[PDB]
Design a protein around this ligand. Structure first.
Ligand SMILES: Nc1nc2c(ncn2[C@@H]2O[C@H](COP(=O)(O)OP(=O)(O)OP(=O)(O)O)C[C@H]2O)c(=O)[nH]1
Ligand SMILES: Nc1ccn([C@@H]2O[C@H](COP(=O)(O)OP(=O)(O)OP(=O)(O)O)C[C@H]2O)c(=O)n1
Ligand SMILES: [Mn+2]
Ligand SMILES: [Mn+2]
Length: 1264
RNA sequence: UAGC
């Protein structure tokens, strides 16, 4: 550690709260990090005096593996294939030797890549060589699934931990987290690597580079080492940052060692990934004595996902685990994978927890962070053959006699059918009828929005489309000479802009390009990038599904972020006396096929949409005539609407299937088109469509099937009390059945058990394998709940992992900084120990803040000041002589965050500056007699501040674009969007109108006329950048670093004029004995105190924020939040109604609607969150789990604590000020470590009137 | 070639 201490000494102290932070120390540490060689990190690791408790037997078979050759073969189709040994799954990268297939590197002599000799032979066609290349390429691919070299994460850990225990400001004592000599993962990482390198000077087992991956030329290396080491690094860091229990951590190291020990690391990891969850989470409290769980009320209407805390629910034996015991299967699983030692130890400990509290949920949490975090990987060929193969087993087919004759491509489900499809057809027909009945549906704007949905900078199988068209002799414009990426649906849009639907129809049957996705703890999944025509024709399906989800069921449309997965619902569902069944349908996409679902859905839509769409086109598609054979004998032609014409063509595609074109870059010679009946995932229908069928079938069960298949009085009662509108929440193939409890306690376990079994049997009837889980736990959208307590699953957020499906290289340097920051926020949302996490993050950041730059022998260095990270969100540990750890990780981001920490130590800063020579005669309103201008330039605070706001990736704009083709393109884009003359006309009105009532007031008028321009830029920025464009980006960051400044942003200089008074601590909003999120307990002071004082966010953030906008959606390309800002800004700038009416017309609204909304906007009382956008203030993501709405409303007093002040009074017409002011008060409160306090407006320098004009100036100047 |  002397090697680490000597080199990072001062820095270590600055991030441990012993000494102040400063850019000089920081940048020097950065330079030290940059000059540490890989092998030096292993040397540093050797200096560590590991304890015996940190050691465990390392399996010798981890080093001696067979040849890859016996693990592959060539099939009847000549494609290289993985040869199965452990079962159908055994398709991943096998654990084998690899050195025998390498050629030493020219320079890094001890490292090697795949023999170029082997590849050429493979490219020739040699079977043995192909096998070898494939294994070589996939093994490498498995190794690329990480953010950067493992040594950087390790080094930062060394630096951070060299600081020793941290003193808690609140608890007023040092934490007791074991030091590194007790870190078992680290010991393994060192020993495993040392054993491989052996007598070699190079200590790294492999090198993660740009030129690819290189293996250390040791006969001891294995294709399983990269995954293994990556797993150990994650555990190593968490044992120190999440305060994980070391005894548990060793259990996780064992599974991993067993994984590398097996014949296929990934396969093994996959087959055992439920060990920790099963022997802890899903087995808690078989016995229960005490503890408290939340008591929540689900407000009406349940669709709002809005809840209210009502105190605590005392627990007792009355609530012990009633769900079936998983013991048997659990022990079996352990026995089958040689892990019965671990499974047993876990069962033993789980039984010792007889009280529900912080301690026990922390144990579950700790247990679950130990699961491997690797992104499983296998060759494309295999994913495609394993995912587009299985077909649903419809145990009860829809009788052939139940269909009418054809009506084009569809057949009507006779209403005489006794098939369960009867009800599936009803829901969709009904929905379709109501959707097409809506006036909005026929509005030129809505149809424009729809048509813009799939016009994105993403792929759409462009090549296959261009050739399907060529087959009918139709050539698309090539826009030869444009600097935009051609494989964008945006490019596609332009090529089709001026072509009749009848000419592009054939494209609906074009092939589909390959697209893949690797996931943590899951198998890779293939994706279907549908083309514009295919997406167009899919509309009716998508809209009818949306109509169902919005009006007929209880469903969520969530993303991937924890902030949007409705946490409140899980707390409710899992709190006794409530119970929940976690439903999931396995092989969902393979389950939605023509034979049952699609052939019925198409018919339903096509018929329920008939009368309202009659005699009308839709989204570009024309009406037409189709052959009719419904009735027997009677065979005529039928006039169908454009909307119907879509279903007509879509039905044709759903019937034929999809031609998945597989170009496997990992398996030489594996080129082939595979036809599959699996449902498309890249379809705009996918998600919404699966959510609708889900709830529809559940409705049919509870309402029809169920009741008809059982006379059990209780099961019938339980069922009757369940409605899909109140008790069943779902998204996609995920379902959460919430059985509310009574005063008599919870519903009988045996009656629930009976119910479930009927659901299972019910699904076999239409080819759906329900994966039902009834274990006392609530699990929805990978969010884990128990007794009202949310259990973060850390294993799913690998600190070093990163998905990399394609062979393409990682993004140039700067890019990694955004990834590092994301790692930090995860740690916040996941509840890691705040001080330990913040310190490590500073280590990690410093370690990635410097990059070597080239300009042609002009070897300089790019360096981000420590201040840039603050701008990005990382809280300061100690600065300007302040006390240590006064800043919380809930500190806002950007300007709002800068204002907050600076406001919290204004005096401190001023005093410090003066005491160091930065004195002046001019008294600053904010910093008194401090020479802040000279100070902030010298500390690189201004520099860091501005550098933070610069693009972290190369810009492609500015590439030479021959004006003429440049105009042809944006024209086609325009035509696509401006298909319907009525819409264009709407915008032209908005324009001439704008020139009379709005032009001049603001300068950001959003307009549909901009979209074509934004679309072009998007297609541009999607293209690969040049080394030149890369040099330009550096120069930019480096120019801002040289430049010196005299102020911050106009907005921030305004916030600084506002002073506050921090007061008495708030009272608890929830019981302090109440577990809400494992990890957030009295051992994690700041996160905890904030949780208790501020309160948890009990409403769905998606539903909440949807209430802060006048318009939900707009044409893709424009920003709903932008539009909201312009309208409110015009109003604040005193613009006339007519002016707002003009803006709305420029974005697509019909005058009637425009004038109505404009008039409505004018008189509304806009809420804090919505109003604060006029000045670009946004609720920090980190705050999303807290009740920020209460804070704004009841704990940020704008009335000075001691009465009215002249400066504090708010001018009549400047009420909007109060909203901006609220964000500033909360910003300081949330940034201050400890309990939320009540902050009181103390002062506004030039007064509120001056402040308002100041903000108005910024407003009217945006975009000039 | 890399989707919603
Ligand atoms: N349409 C669509 N749905 C997605 C996507 N990613 C996830 N989902 C949906 O949300 C669900 C949760 O998926 P996961 O893949 O577990 O993502 P995650 O939510 O980020 O998991 P984590 O807990 O580790 O943060 C599965 C699926 O129905 C995506 O890219 N597109
Ligand atoms: N990047 C992703 C990931 C998932 N999905 C969609 O999510 C849906 C179901 O989610 P999973 O449960 O994750 O997929 P399954 O195929 O059902 O997994 P398996 O039975 O193990 O659960 C189907 C799939 O198309 C998607 O469109 N895009
Ligand atoms: Mn599933
Ligand atoms: Mn699912």
């Amino acid at each position: 550690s002397s090697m680490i201490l000597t080199q990072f000494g001062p820095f270590i102290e600055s991030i441990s709260g012993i000494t102040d932070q400063s850019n000089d120390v920081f940048e020097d540490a950065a330079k030290a990090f940059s000059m540490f060689t890989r092998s030096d990190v292993y040397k540093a690791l050797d200096e560590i005096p590991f304890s015996d408790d940190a050691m465990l037997p390392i399996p010798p078979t981890i080093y001696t593996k067979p040849s890859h050759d016996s693990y592959y073969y060539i099939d009847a189709l000549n494609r290289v294939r993985r040869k199965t040994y452990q079962g159908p799954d055994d398709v991943y990268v096998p654990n084998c030797s690899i050195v025998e297939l390498l050629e030493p590197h020219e320079t890094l002599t001890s490292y090697g890549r795949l023999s170029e000799a082997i590849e050429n032979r493979a490219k020739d066609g040699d079977s043995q060589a192909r096998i070898a290349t494939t294994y070589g390429r996939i093994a490498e691919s498995q190794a690329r699934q990480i953010k950067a070299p493992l040594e950087k994460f390790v080094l930062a850990l060394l630096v951070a931990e060299a600081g020793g225990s941290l003193y808690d400001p609140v608890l007023q004592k040092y934490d007791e987290i074991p030091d590194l000599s007790h870190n078992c993962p680290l010991w393994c990482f060192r020993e495993i690597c040392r054993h491989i390198s052996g007598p070699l000077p190079d200590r790294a087992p492999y090198l993660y580079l740009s030129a690819g991956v290189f293996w250390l030329m040791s006969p001891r290396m294995t294709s399983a080492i990269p995954p293994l080491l990556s797993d150990l690094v994650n555990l190593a860091i968490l044992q120190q940052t999440a305060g994980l229990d070391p005894s548990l951590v060793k259990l996780g190291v064992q599974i991993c060692l067993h994984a590398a020990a097996s014949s296929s690391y990934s396969w093994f990891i996959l087959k055992t990934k439920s060990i920790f969850p099963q022997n802890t989470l899903h087995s808690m409290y078989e016995s229960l004595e005490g503890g408290y769980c939340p008591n929540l009320e689900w407000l009406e209407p349940r669709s709002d996902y809005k809840f209210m805390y009502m105190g605590v629910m005392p627990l007792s034996a009355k609530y012990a685990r009633s769900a079936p015991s998983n013991d048997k299967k659990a022990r079996e699983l352990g026995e089958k994978y040689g892990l019965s030692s671990v499974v047993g130890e876990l069962r033993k400990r789980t039984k010792t927890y007889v009280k529900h509290d912080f301690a026990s949920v922390r144990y579950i949490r700790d247990a679950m962070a130990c699961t491997s975090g690797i992104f499983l990987v296998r060759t494309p060929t295999e994913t495609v053959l394993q995912e587009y193969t299985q077909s649903p087993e419809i145990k009860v087919p829809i009788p052939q006699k139940d269909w009418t004759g054809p009506i084009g491509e569809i057949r009507i489900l006779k209403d005489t059918t006794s098939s369960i499809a009867r009800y599936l057809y009803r829901t969709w027909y009904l929905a379709a009828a109501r959707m097409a009945a809506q006036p909005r549906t026929w509005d030129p704007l809505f149809q424009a929005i729809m048509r813009s949905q799939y016009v994105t900078a993403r792929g759409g199988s462009g090549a296959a489309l261009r050739e399907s068209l060529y087959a009918i002799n139709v050539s698309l414009p090539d826009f030869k000479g444009l600097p935009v990426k051609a494989a964008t649906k945006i490019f596609q849009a332009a090529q089709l802009a001026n072509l009749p639907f009848s000419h592009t129809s054939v494209a609906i049957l074009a092939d589909t390009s390959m697209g893949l996705r690797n996931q943590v703890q899951r198998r890779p999944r293939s994706i279907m990038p549908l083309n514009v025509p295919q997406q167009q024709v899919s509309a009716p399906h998508t809209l009818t599904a949306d109509y169902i989800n919005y009006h007929m069921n209880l469903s969520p449309t969530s993303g991937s972020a924890v902030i949007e997965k409705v946490i409140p619902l899980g707390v409710y569902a899992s709190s006794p006396p409530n119970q929940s069944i976690n439903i999931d349908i396995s092989a969902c996409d393979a389950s939605i096929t023509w034979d049952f679902f699609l052939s019925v859905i198409m018919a339903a839509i096509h018929e329920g949409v008939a009368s309202s769409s009659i005699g009308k086109p839709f989204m570009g598609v024309p009406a037409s005539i189709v052959n009719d054979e419904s009735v027997v004998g009677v065979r005529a032609a039928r006039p169908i609407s454009g909307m119907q014409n879509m279903i007509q063509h879509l039905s044709k595609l759903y019937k034929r299937g999809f031609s998945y074109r597989v170009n496997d870059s990992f398996s030489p010679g594996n080129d082939f088109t595979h036809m599959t009946t699996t449902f498309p995932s890249g379809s705009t229908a996918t998600s919404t469509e699966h959510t609708a069928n889900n709830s529809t079938m559940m409705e049919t069960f509870l309402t029809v099937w169920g009741p008809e298949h059982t006379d059990d009085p209780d099961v019938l009662r339980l069922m009757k009390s369940l409605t899909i509108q109140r008790n069943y929440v779902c998204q996609g193939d995920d379902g959460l059945m919430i059985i509310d409890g009574t005063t008599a306690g919870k519903v009988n376990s045996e009656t629930i058990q009976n119910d479930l079994e009927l659901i299972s049997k019910y699904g076999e009837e239409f080819g759906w394998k329900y994966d039902i889980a009834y274990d006392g736990t609530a699990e929805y959208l990978k969010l884990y709940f128990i007794f009202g307590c949310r259990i973060p699953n850390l294993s799913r957020h690998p600190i070093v992992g990163k998905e990399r499906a394609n062979s393409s290289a990682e993004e140039p340097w700067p890019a990694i900084l955004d990834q590092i920051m994301g790692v930090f926020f995860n740690g916040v949302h996941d509840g890691l120990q705040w001080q330990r996490w913040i310190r490590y993050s500073w280590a990690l950041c410093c370690a990635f803040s410097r990059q070597r730059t080239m300009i042609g022998e002009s070897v300089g260095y790019l360096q981000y000041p420590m201040w840039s990270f603050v701008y990005w969100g990382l809280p300061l540990v100690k600065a300007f002589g302040s006390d240590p750890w006064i800043f919380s990780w809930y500190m806002p981001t950007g300007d709002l965050g800068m204002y907050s920490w600076i406001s919290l130590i204004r005096p401190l800063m001023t005093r410090w500056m003066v005491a160091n020579g930065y004195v002046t005669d001019r008294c600053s309103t904010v910093f008194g007699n401090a020479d802040y201008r000279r100070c902030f330039n010298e500390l690189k605070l201004y520099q860091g501040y501005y550098m933070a706001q610069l693009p972290r990736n190369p810009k492609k704009s500015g590439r030479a674009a021959s004006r003429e083709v440049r105009e042809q393109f944006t024209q086609a884009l325009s035509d696509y969007l401006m298909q319907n003359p009525e819409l264009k006309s709407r915008v032209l009105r908005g324009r001439s109108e704008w020139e009379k009532y709005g032009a001049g007031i603001i300068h950001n008028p959003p307009s549909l006329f901009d979209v074509p321009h934004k679309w072009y830029q998007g297609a541009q920025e999607a293209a690969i950048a040049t080394r030149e464009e890369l040099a330009e980006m550096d120069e930019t960051l480096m120019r801002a670093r040289r430049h010196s400044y005299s102020s911050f942003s106009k907005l921030l200089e305004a916030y600084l004029l506002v002073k506050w008074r921090m007061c008495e601590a708030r009272e608890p909003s929830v019981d302090l004995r109440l577990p809400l999120c494992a990890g957030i307990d009295p051992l994690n002071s700041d996160p905890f105190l904030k949780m208790v004082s501020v309160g948890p966010m009990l409403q769905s953030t998606r539903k909440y924020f949807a209430q802060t906008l006048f318009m939900a959606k707009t044409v893709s390309g424009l920003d709903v939040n932008a539009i909201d800002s312009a309208l409110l800004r015009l109003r604040t700038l005193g613009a006339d109604k007519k002016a707002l009416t003009a803006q709305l017309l420029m974005v697509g609204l019909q005058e009637s609607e425009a004038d109505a909304l404009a008039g409505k906007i004018m008189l509304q009382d806009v809420n804090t969150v919505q109003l604060a956008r006029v000045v670009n203030l946004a609720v920090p993501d980190t705050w999303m789990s807290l009740d920020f709405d209460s804070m704004f409303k009841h704990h940020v007093k704008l009335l000075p604590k001691d009465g009215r002040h002249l400066n504090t009074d708010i001018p009549p017409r400047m009420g909007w000020l109060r909203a901006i002011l609220r964000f500033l008060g909360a910003g300081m409160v949330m940034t201050a470590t400890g309990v939320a306090v009540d902050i009181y407006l103390e002062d506004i320098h030039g007064g509120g009137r001056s402040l308002g004009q100041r903000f108005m100036t910024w407003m009217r100047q945006e975009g000039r």
